[PDB]
Write a protein that binds this ligand. Structure first.
Ligand SMILES: *[C@@H]1O[C@H](CO)[C@@H](O[C@@H]2O[C@H](CO)[C@@H](O[C@@H]3O[C@H](CO[C@H]4O[C@H](CO)[C@@H](O)[C@H](O[C@H]5O[C@H](CO)[C@@H](O)[C@H](O)[C@@H]5O[C@H]5O[C@H](CO)[C@@H](O)[C@H](O)[C@@H]5O)[C@@H]4O)[C@@H](O)[C@H](O[C@H]4O[C@H](CO)[C@@H](O)[C@H](O)[C@@H]4O[C@H]4O[C@H](CO)[C@@H](O)[C@H](O)[C@@H]4O)[C@@H]3O)[C@H](O)[C@H]2NC(C)=O)[C@H](O)[C@H]1NC(C)=O
Ligand SMILES: Cc1nnc(-c2cccc(C3=Nc4ccc(-c5ccccc5F)cc4NC(=O)C3)c2)o1
Ligand SMILES: [Ca+2]
Ligand SMILES: [Cl-]
Ligand code: NA
Ligand code: NA
Ligand SMILES: [Zn+2]
Length: 808
């Protein structure tokens, strides 16, 4: 119940929300159907429109008007935004040449530059260039301030997951808004765009920017706006708040536009109807900047122009129907569209089996436009699994397509020409970032980055301590003139042992064999040096990775590679090696095909054994340092050490073998040498974080050899590829991957063909940031480079996306 009988007199767009049943006057009262009876009359005035005209200049104040052009309007803070232009001979902000803002120029009583976030729904990154001719204000922000060619959203590329990621710095799996539609089985409640369940605080996790601010004594405008409040009135309201007394005035504000998403859905991303909505958005930006100039704030406020996600061409006719795949379509519930999420329709159905559903959806039609996954098998870069609201079965839908349960869902539930929600590396889903103001840099372009990084920066801009989040604080310091955040490298927690030769061959009973009894004070002194680390500077280019948890491990040196060997997991945490542009690939000699050699630096009790692999009929093994890239026949024997062996399903060995034999050399050729760090990952609870030993769900049968869920590689080279990887003076270039260690290649529909037709495609789908690998392993990479730490944090958040150019 609401008692709408109260009044909004002097309360229009009040900042504190009053408790029911008292009637509300804040910018969300409409959405809750709780506004006081006079809200429209008093707070949503429209009389005479939004612009001053010559004949209103000096007019006598009439409080009925939407905005004012009377002499007293500046001190009241409620002039139309073009007042000084029309009535006082001033220029529009967009018509002034841009002048660097070297320091904040703020009026007396301003304790810090305010922050204004101007957020636009469905603003595809390519609009900045393709629409630049009709968006002069936005183009001025862009060219004069700091901009990215694009900003990466989170998956799914839907509105509320991305807006709330922007507000919290968290992946959707962590903040809880994992889609625009959701079912939470613990609450037994559904979240919908339409209705009142979505207002319940329980859905919304983490700590959003407006709460972080308020707890630290920084006041915030209310970020949300009821759809019916026109944009002009949103802007006037913000400008009025900025004229409040110092002690009452917020320091952070948000404007939100439903455009261009609204029209994009109807007309497609570049439908000719899309020009007008872009013009109108620009006009709104102009109104803000003009109003700021009027208040003498245009060289004081930091403005962020940011989108949530892009927009792709999608039509009714590009829909896949689960009824064409499944026999039992009515036993399932499907969350449909640009992603699919499937669960059982009834928890009382004992014949529901996810394995049979997945199989019926796997590679069934030649040009099938979606692919099914158990969520723990989704690309780890999506970070989309660790939440009870994310159904076990997920469908990744190809760009330009939909999935639905049955055809009647699509006509009796054509219309639409655009949609979004696809994989967040897709070019059409990318969105925008521009920062302008004293704290941002001047005429600076920065590389694309992920929207999860922005919360930290918005906190830096306001002097706030960020709540714990998924950004890497410092990775965006290069966007800022001042207020950078200067982190220290984390402390190493475990120091390595450096074992020498401590065991005789006969102490081992691993059931291994090797034909290596073939064999000089020359290269015997020399191989002793190699085992003591004499070539380590070549193969460990950026320092040893630091182990950031308590464990027991050994550094092992070799001619061609160096490793950190875990006595707990019985395998390397990491193996590091450098392959020059000139390196030659060789074979595994016939007599060494099944060679595995005891490592006399490591006890039998801390070694794998070959008998376990013989007896486990499902499991084989591979090597981290590839025998194919040995520097010489004699060095190749090091590659067959038991301490370089890792457990691999035969199906996976196909992928790994092709990576090691073909691709590494290819990358060394293309990049002028590469440094490779490879290793296992264990994430059985799919939380994105290194498993402890007691979370491991599978071992090589009969043994304590844990089975990885994933294998990673970090491949580093010189950004200036005229320098070799091992003699690089400047910035680095990286690409990484986290490959699922699966017992089949069902993920790859063409896997019966030659690896040259499918393996690389798989690896591109599983591209990763170095930072993702850090979470998954508890390792810290790049500790000893000649680069600044912030630059290195940027490198660690890099994602190599293998998408074509944005714009063609
Ligand atoms: C991205 O960044 C985020 C944030 O930094 C990272 O997430 C953090 O990860 C930590 C490790 O997973 C985790 O720490 C745990 O906190 C538990 C208390 O959490 C509550 O309080 C906090 C603080 O305000 C709050 O933020 C939490 O919010 C979660 O849950 C609410 C609902 O209750 C949601 O609204 C919200 O969206 C959020 O959900 C998300 O996180 C939870 C996990 O907390 C997931 O389950 C959801 O799916 C969703 O992803 C909570 O309200 C604390 O209790 C934990 O302590 C246990 O584990 C420690 C380990 O040290 C152990 O020593 C203890 O004994 C204890 O175990 C006991 O409980 C077990 C389970 O019942 C039981 O098995 C044992 O036997 C014991 O009884 C733990 O310290 C932290 O909460 C989250 N924070 C957030 C905001 O998500 C995330 O890792 C980053 N991602 C990547 C890839 O890096
Ligand atoms: C509680 C609650 N339950 N439902 C609603 C509700 C109802 C109607 C609209 C909205 C909207 N919310 C957001 C969310 C995030 C940001 C944002 C943008 C950039 C950077 C940081 C940010 F936080 C701006 C927003 N403003 C809007 O107007 C859209 C929300 O609120
Ligand atoms: Ca884990
Ligand atoms: Cl109302
Ligand atoms: Na085997
Ligand atoms: Na296959
Ligand atoms: Zn939309």
């Amino acid at each position: 119940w609401t008692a709408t009988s109260g009044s909004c007199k002097g309360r229009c767009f009040e900042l504190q929300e009053v408790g029911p049943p008292d009637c509300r006057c804040d910018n969300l009262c409409k959405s809750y159907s709780s506004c006081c009876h006079d809200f429209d009359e008093l707070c949503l005035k429209t009389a005479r429109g939004w612009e001053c005209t010559k004949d209103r200049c000096g007019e006598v104040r009439n409080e009925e008007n939407a905005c004012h052009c009377s002499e007293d309007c500046l001190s009241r803070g409620d002039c139309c935004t073009n007042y000084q232009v029309v009535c006082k001979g001033e220029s529009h902000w967009v018509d002034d040449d841009c002048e660097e803002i070297k320091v904040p120029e703020c009026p007396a009583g301003f304790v810090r530059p305010p922050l204004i976030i101007f957020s636009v729904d469905g603003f595809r990154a390519s609009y900045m260039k393709k629409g630049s001719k009709v968006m002069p204000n936005i183009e001025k922000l862009r060219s004069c301030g700091t901009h990215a060619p694009y900003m990466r959203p989170v998956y799914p590329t839907k509105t509320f997951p991305n807006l709330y990621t922007l507000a919290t710095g968290l992946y959707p799996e962590s903040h809880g808004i994992v889609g625009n539609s959701m079912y939470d089985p613990v609450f037994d409640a559904s979240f919908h765009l339409r209705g009142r369940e979505k207002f319940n605080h329980r859905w919304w996790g983490g700590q959003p920017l407006w709460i972080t601010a308020t707890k630290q004594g920084v006041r915030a405008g209310t970020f949300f706006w009821s759809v019916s409040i026109p944009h002009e009135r949103r802007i006037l309201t913000i400008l009025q708040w900025l004229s409040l007394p110092d002690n009452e005035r917020p320091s952070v504000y948000a404007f939100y536009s439903e455009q261009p998403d609204f029209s994009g859905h109807k007309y497609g991303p570049f439908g000719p109807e899309m020009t007008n909505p872009l013009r109108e958005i620009d006009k709104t930006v102009g109104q803000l900047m003009d109003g700021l100039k009027q208040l003498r704030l245009h060289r004081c406020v930091n403005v962020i122009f940011v989108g949530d996600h892009g927009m792709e061409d999608v039509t009714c006719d590009r829909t896949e129907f689960l009824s064409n795949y499944l026999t039992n379509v009515d036993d399932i519930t499907l969350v449909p569209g640009t992603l699919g999420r499937i669960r059982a329709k009834s928890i009382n159905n004992s014949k529901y089996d996810p394995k049979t559903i997945i199989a019926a959806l796997t590679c069934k039609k030649p040009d099938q436009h979606f692919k099914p996954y158990m969520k723990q098998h989704l690309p780890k870069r999506l970070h989309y699994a660790n939440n009870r609201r994310i159904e076990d079965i997920h469908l990744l839908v190809d760009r330009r397509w939909h999935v639905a349960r049955k055809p009647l869902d699509v006509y009796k539930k054509c219309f639409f020409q655009g949609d979004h929600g696809f994989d967040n590396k897709v070019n059409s889903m990318q969105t925008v970032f521009v920062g302008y103001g004293p704290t941002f840099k001047y005429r600076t372009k920065v590389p694309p980055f992920e929207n999860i990084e922005l919360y930290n920066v918005m906190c830096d801009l306001l002097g706030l301590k960020p709540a714990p989040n998924n950004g890497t604080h410092g990775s965006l310091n290069h966007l800022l003139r001042t207020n950078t955040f200067r982190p220290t490298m984390p402390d190493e927690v475990s120091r390595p042992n450096y074992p020498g030769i401590m065991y005789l061959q006969s102490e081992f009973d691993l059931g291994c064999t090797c034909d290596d009894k073939v064999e000089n004070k020359l290269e015997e002194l020399n191989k002793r040096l190699h085992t003591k680390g004499s070539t380590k500077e070549r193969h460990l280019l950026y320092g040893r990775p630091a182990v950031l948890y308590r464990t027991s491990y050994d550094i092992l040196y070799h001619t061609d590679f160096e490793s950190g060997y875990s006595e707990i997991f019985l395998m390397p945490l990491w193996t590091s090696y450098t392959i020059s542009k000139q390196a030659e690939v060789s074979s595994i000699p016939e007599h060494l095909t099944n060679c595995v050699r005891p490592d006399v630096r490591v006890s039998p009790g801390f070694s794998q054994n070959c008998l376990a692999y013989k007896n486990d009929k499902q499991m084989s093994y591979g090597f981290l340092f590839p025998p194919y890239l040995s520097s010489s026949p004699e060095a190749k024997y090091d590659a067959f050490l038991v301490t370089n062996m890792v457990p691999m399903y035969p199906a996976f060995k196909r992928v790994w073998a092709y990576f090691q034999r073909v691709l590494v050399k290819k990358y060394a050729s293309e990049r002028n040498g590469v440094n490779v760090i490879s290793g296992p990952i264990f994430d059985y609870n799919y939380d994105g974080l290194r498993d402890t030993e007691d979370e491991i769900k599978q071992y090589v049968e009969g043994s304590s050899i844990p089975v990885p869920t994933h294998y990673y590689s970090i491949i580093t080279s010189c950004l200036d590829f005229t320098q070799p990887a091992d003699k690089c003076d400047g910035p680095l270039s990286v690409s990484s991957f986290i490959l699922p260690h699966r017992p089949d290649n069902d993920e790859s529909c063409n896997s019966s063909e030659d690896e040259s037709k499918w393996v690389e495609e798989l690896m591109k789908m599983h591209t990763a940031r170095v930072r993702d690998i850090e979470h998954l392993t508890g390792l810290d990479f790049y500790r000893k480079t000649s680069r600044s730490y912030s630059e290195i944090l940027t490198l660690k958040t890099y994602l190599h996306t293998y998408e074509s150019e944005i714009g063609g």
